[PDB]
Each structure stands twice: as C-alpha cells, then as structure tokens.
Amino acid sequence: MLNTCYRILGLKPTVIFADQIMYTGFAYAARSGASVGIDDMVIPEKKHEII
Amino acid sequence: KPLVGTGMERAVAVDSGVTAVAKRGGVVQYVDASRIVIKVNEDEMYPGEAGIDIYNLTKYTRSNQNTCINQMPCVSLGEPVERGDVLADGPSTDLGELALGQNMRVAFMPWNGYNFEDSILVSERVVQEDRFTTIHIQELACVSRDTKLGPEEITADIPNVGEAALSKLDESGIVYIGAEVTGGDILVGKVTPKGETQLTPEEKLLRAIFGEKASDVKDSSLRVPNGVSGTVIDVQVFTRDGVEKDKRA
Amino acid sequence: TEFLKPRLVDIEQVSSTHAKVTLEPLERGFGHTLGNALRRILLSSMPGCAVTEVEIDGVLHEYSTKEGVQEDILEILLNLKGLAVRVQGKDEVILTLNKSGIGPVTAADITHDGDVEIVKPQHVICHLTDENASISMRIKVQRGRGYVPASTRIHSEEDERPIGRLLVDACYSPVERIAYNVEAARVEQRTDLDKLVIEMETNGTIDPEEAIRRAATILAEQLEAFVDLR
Amino acid sequence: TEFLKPRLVDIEQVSSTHAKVTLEPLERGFGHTLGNALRRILLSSMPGCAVTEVEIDGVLHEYSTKEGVQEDILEILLNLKGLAVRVQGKDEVILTLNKSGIGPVTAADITHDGDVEIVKPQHVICHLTDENASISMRIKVQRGRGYVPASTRIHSEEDERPIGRLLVDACYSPVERIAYNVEAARVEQRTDLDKLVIEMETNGTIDPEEAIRRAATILAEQLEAFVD
Amino acid sequence: QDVVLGLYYMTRDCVNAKGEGMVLTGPKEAERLYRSGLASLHARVKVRIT
Amino acid sequence: EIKELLKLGDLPTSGQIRLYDGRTGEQFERPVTVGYMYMLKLNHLVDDKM
Secondary structure: OHHHHHHHOOOHHHHHHHHHHHHHHHHHHHHHOOOOOOOOOOOOOOHHHHO | OOOOOOOHHHHHHHHOOOOEEOOOOEEEEEEOOOEEEEEEOOOOOOOOOOOEEEEEOOOOEOOOOOOOEOOEEOOOOOOEEOOOOEEEEOOOEEOOEEOOOEEEEEEEOOOOOOOOOOOOOOOHHHHHOOOOOOOOOOOOOOOOOEOOOOEOEOOOOOOOOOOOOOOOEOOOOEEOOOOEEEEOEEEEOOEEOOOOOOOOHHHHHHHHHOOOOOOOOEEOOEEOOOOOEEEOOOOOOOOOOOOOOOOOO | OOOOOOEEEEEEOOOOOEEEEEEEOEOOOHHHHHHHHHHHHHHHOOEEEEEEEEEEOOOOOOOOOOOOEOOOHHHHHHHHHOOOEEEOOOOEEEEEEEEEOOOEEEHHHEEOOOOEEEOOOOOEEEEEOOOOOEEEEEEEEEEEEOOEOOOOOOOOOOOOOOOOEEEOOEOOOOEEEEEEEEEEOOOOOOOOOEEEEEEEEEOOOOOHHHHHHHHHHHHHHHOHHHHOOO | OOOOOOEEEEEEOOOOOEEEEEEEOEOOOHHHHHHHHHHHHHHHOOEEEEEEEEEEOOOOOOOOOOOOEOOOHHHHHHHHHOOOEEEOOOOEEEEEEEEEOOOEEEHHHEEOOOOEEEOOOOOEEEEEOOOOOEEEEEEEEEEEEOOEOHHHHOOOOOOOOOOOOEEOOEOOOOOOEEEEEEEEOOOOOOOOOEEEEEEEEOOOOOOHHHHHHHHHHHHHHOOOOOOO | OHHHHHHHHHHOOOOOOOOOOOOOOOHHHHHHHHHHOOOOOOOOOOOOOO | OHHHHHHHOOOOOOOEEOOEOOOOOOEOOOOEEEEEEEEOOOOOOHHHOO
C-alpha cells in the first residue's frame, strides 16, 4: 500500500498515509479487545492420540 | 506480599539475614519501632542467665545501591512466639515471606499505542496509593584536607554566599537533622586556603564597589548535587585526634 | 426538540458508604453520555476535607522513630490521610491530639473543634505500647478536591519553611469507587429507552445523594460557556 | 470549587458542510468527558428530515425492474435516503416527482412544496435511458431523529404493513461525521490544560455551531431533575 | 505489530453479523453505524464509494 | 485447579472480563484478560538516567 502510494502520489502523501495507517492500526487493534487467554492456546483434539 | 508465589518466599527472606528471627520462643515482653524484647519460656530458657533476648532492629539507613533498609516489628505487644519465628520483617519481606514488588489488577489489551513495544500504561490510582514510590538513601561526604598552603576547616563562615544557603546550616556548618535539601543548597560548609590571588582589575574594582573583601581562604563546601532532592535522616562526623571541634560536633 | 427529561426515582442506600441510584426515563444513547461524563467528574472533581500537614513534638521528619510506639511516623501519617473529617464553616482547621498510657490511639482522642466532625471516632491513628509513653501532635485539615500530594505541594508557595511540619498526601476526593449500569426502561411504546443505575462507594461524610447533586451542578457550571458564548 | 469554564474561541467554517470548532480553556480530563459525551448526542439525538416511504406507479415492490431505467428500485430508494430535504412547518410531507425523456432525474425535477427546501437540486435520484420512458412517484418525508431503518422499524412498529410500501432507511440525523481532537492549551502556569477541537460534518439543514448549542441545551435540560 | 493487527481486524470479514447486506451513502455512514452499535466491522455490505 | 479456584471466587472460568473504556464509557468490542500480576520496580529509574 505504502510502496504503491509512493510510486504514484509522492512523498508528502505517503508520510501522512503511513502515520494514519499506524494510528488507526493501533486504535482498532485496541478496540478489538485482543487478549491472551489460556483457552486461546487451543491444543488439537487428538494430540494424545498422535504421540 | 505476592499473591502468586511459589512458597520459597519465606525461605529467602529468613535466610537472607535481612529479617530478625527469634532465637528462643516465648512472649514478647516489649514491642518497639527501634527494638524488640522477648521473654523466654522455662523449657528453652537457660537456668544460669536471666533469659530475655535483645534484638535492636536496624532502622532506616543506607544501602550499597542507595536505597532504604528498614526492620519493622511483625509482632504485637505481648504475643506468644515460637522458637525460630520471624519477629521483625525486612525491607522487602512481609510476615517473613519475600515481598519484592507489588501485585495489582492488570489487563492485557492495547491502548492507543501507549503499550506499543512492551510500553506500560499505569493508572494514577497506583501513584495515588504511592505504592510504587521507592526510597533512595544517598551519602554525600565532606573532606577537610591539609593542602600545601595550610589546613582546611568546617565553619558556617563561607565567602560569597546568600543567607538563604546558610539558613539550613547551624553554627558548626552542618545541615540540621530532618532538613529538606535541593540541588544548590549546601549540606556541609567547607573552606580551604587561598594563595597568591591576582585580583583582576574588573574584580578589584567590583570588590571595591560593593565591598565585602574576601579573606585568605578558598570555598569548596559540599553542596547537594545539581538535581537531587531529599530529606537528611542523619549526619556522622569523623575527626583526627587534635584540633578543637565544632559546637554541632 | 422532543425533550424527555429523567427524574430521580429510587435511592436504595444499602450502606452509608455504598448506595445505588436508579434513574429513568432516559432517552437512548444518553445512558452512557451521562453515565461516564458523570463518573469522570465524580472521581476527579468531587471536593472534601483531608489531612494536609501534621506537626509532632520530639519529631523532625516522617522517617524517624518515637519510643513507646509500634507504628513508625509514616505509618501514622497514612492513618491520618484516610482519617474521615468534616469541617462545617472553615476551609482550614488545625486540631490538636494529646494522649498517653497503654491505649490504641483512636480519633476520639483528638480534641474536636466547635465546627469539626470526626466521622469515625474509633478510627485507629497510632498504637501505644509503653504506659510511660506520651504522644502529642497538631493535625492541619484543609478542604480541596481530587488528590494533592506532598511532591506537588513542595514546589509552589512555601513561604514559612518551619523545621517540623511534615507534609502528607491528602485524599480530598471522597468517592472511592463509582460505576454506572445502563439497563432498559420499557415504556408502552418506547422500549429502546434506558435506565441509569449509579453504584457509588464513598468514604464517610459526603452523602451519596448530595455528591450526585454537586457533580451535576458542576457539569452545568461548565455548560454555561456553551449556552451563553454560542 | 475552582470552577474554570471554557469559552467558544474560534469557529473556522472551512465549508458550510464541514466546520472546525476550537475550545479553551478546558481543565484536564474534561477534554474527553465533553468530547465523547457530546459526540454521542450529536450523532444519535440531533433531529432531521428524511425519506420514510415512497410510492411508484407500475411498481409493487422494491425488488422489481422498470424499463427505461439503469438503476434498480432499491438503488433509487438509496438515492432518496440521502436526499437532503428540509420541512419548515409540518413534520410529514408527501412530495410528487414526474419526469420523462433522456435526462438524469435530479432533485430539481421534484415539485417542491410551499414549505419544503430541497438543499441539493442537482442530487441524482434516477437515470433515464429511453426517451419513451416516463417515471412518476410519491415521496413521503417525515421528521425524526437518529437512524430508524426498516429492520429497527419492524421490531417496534408491527401495526399496518402492507405489500408494495417500500420502506427506505431514513437518515433523520443531519450530522454525518463528528470527531473531537484533544490538544494541549498552555497557560502561564497551567500547561496541563487541554483544548477541544470538534470537526463536525452536517448536511446544511442545521448549522454546525447551532447543532452544538442544541446538544448542550438538551444536556442542561436533563440536569433540571438534579436540583442545581 | 498492533497497527497491522488492527487493520487485519478491520478489513477481515465475517458471516452476516449485525446489519448484513445493508447499503450506505459513504464510508462515513459505516463509521456512523459501527460506533452506533448497529453493524460489526465484519459485515458484508454494498457501499457506494467514489 | 486454577479454573476450579475461579469458580470458588465466583470469577469467570475464562479469566477474560467485560471491560469498559474509561475515556468514553462504551464497552470494548470483546473481553480482555484481567487479573493480579506481581510486578516489580526495577532500579533503572529515569531520574538517575536523564
């Protein structure tokens, strides 16, 4: 996206774009609620069957 | 105390020799912030001596890393204590168990990038409880030397000074116990001998305009380092065996 | 405008510290608009009386020790931060406390001022072990708001610097926990409406209902800038 | 109380649709307290006029086709949702629209009512390809607030609902985008203060500055129950 | 890190969810409906963008 | 054992709680792990660095 933006529009547009991408990225990443529960680390059904 | 420990907590705190554990079991005859007095039971107590152990707890003083060292009593007045029990807790110990840091309600989620690369977002409520507020114990020293020109001494008489600087000092030239200090304020007044001094024309005129003719002695008073600010908790004076003393000494 | 104003319906005061305040009818979206906007003010802006300065004889700093006392001086200061106090007329009162002998020093040992209420007279302030031991101090209680630490107060006015006055963090704000619940109010036709239940959990003194009225009035004081100036 | 009230400083109206409103001085923490509390009201509670019901002849449902027309009927309904309309006296008006021949049907082809303003007469509503083709319809514009779509309307009004009545999601709310920026206001001593920049974007039926005063006035009217 | 994750969350789609197959004037009405609580960031929608 | 202890505390089996943004008041889009982590204050303090 940034390379495209650069080769097309130029420098100014990219710096802005790059920042805005970063800002919305962080913001919406935080809105997601993204966490690290231990039920998030799902072991497959049949591990004890394979080993 | 740590809510999420291993059990090794007490073992560390006790064996470190930073806490004060009971040599003999019995009832604490007297509790105090400075010391602990415990009465020994008949079975343990020796028949020869009286049988009352003394434990003068190490109170707030310095560390090798310039931090606090305290021993608070973890026992109540007149409490029955068993042999080998923690009587006073150390600087990082709680009911004998190790207490290095503090536990708190944490939540894993990003926050407008204020936790970007492992960056931490802490509540003001943590700062309000002053719970992560650590104590630093610095030790600034002041040396009276014997130069080729003559001996140095330690008096309140310092040339080129504000009454504001000599306010926290006494007559001897040492800051009071409990006096708050800040970078630029002088802890201990010192003066060294000043030799053949070429008073530059612009200084001979300036010392002849306002006056205040300085004496034959240089200035080198120990002043709080530019930036540091705390409370003086104690001051200790070491002297050779000779020259008469300051009144504060 | 289809202005639909709410009305203070029920106040279940389960305890003088913790009390619920249900609110309806609220038009949709305003449940949270008010809910949080209020919460923010109710935590930060709410005013009360707290200990600012203390002064003990035979004491020069908060780090030192006093014989015949279990707690150190800092541990005493902390007990005086959360000392529940009300000051009726003035904004600055200096109460005196003398006590001795073997007794757990409570807030009832303080000589209460003509226009000063100590809410919790059983509140522990210090423990005396030796009977020979005697404590004497002067507690300055000022009125403010939010949280004013000693580090924010040791870089401002500071006229008289008397060696002996120990500054202690004064937790002026009385609200300790606040949280608002937004449930659904069902009207014959309006079933999308919501009710606002504010669960407030404060220290002594500042009454739950009185605090809500103080926070709403301060928000309306800030809004006179938007009614008048465009 | 150290009450520190703000004052409406600058209003840079870059366009009649989009206008910035800088605000200071605000005491710390209130920048967001107001910022969002306002945003929420300004999106949901602000009232406006929007198309509710439409009625086209030779048409029985919104899924069908009409010859001589590029757009489908749903595509037309969507153009009428975002049709900018003002109704001066009444709260319910039924405008009529007749047009024919090869011409991009605009909002100027609508027969405007004595007390009805079509803000954008160039607004596209339908495209006519055949010259023989002729379109005729009856647009009902009601006044409401927020967003009331057919899904949210069929969950609440389950009274009269006959076939043929194309329910278009009427965008009553005139604020389209609102977002507030919290910058730092520096006073000689107070350097922790903040300023509130609200970048709003309405349609034109309500003035940006006027809309902020409506959302602050409704908030003060809900505080009449709390004595002071 | 977060920036990339936050964008992936946004763009990535899901089945129906709240307000499937709705129809919007612009990308501003999409922010309007999501933050209004009447659409998920993962809803298939026929929007008109220029 | 941990999930059994959480049932005694009438806490969620998950360990993720329904969180609300303080700035705003509206809920976050989906649950977040909350609990008590014993953290430490390292000697590397900024007053001793800058």
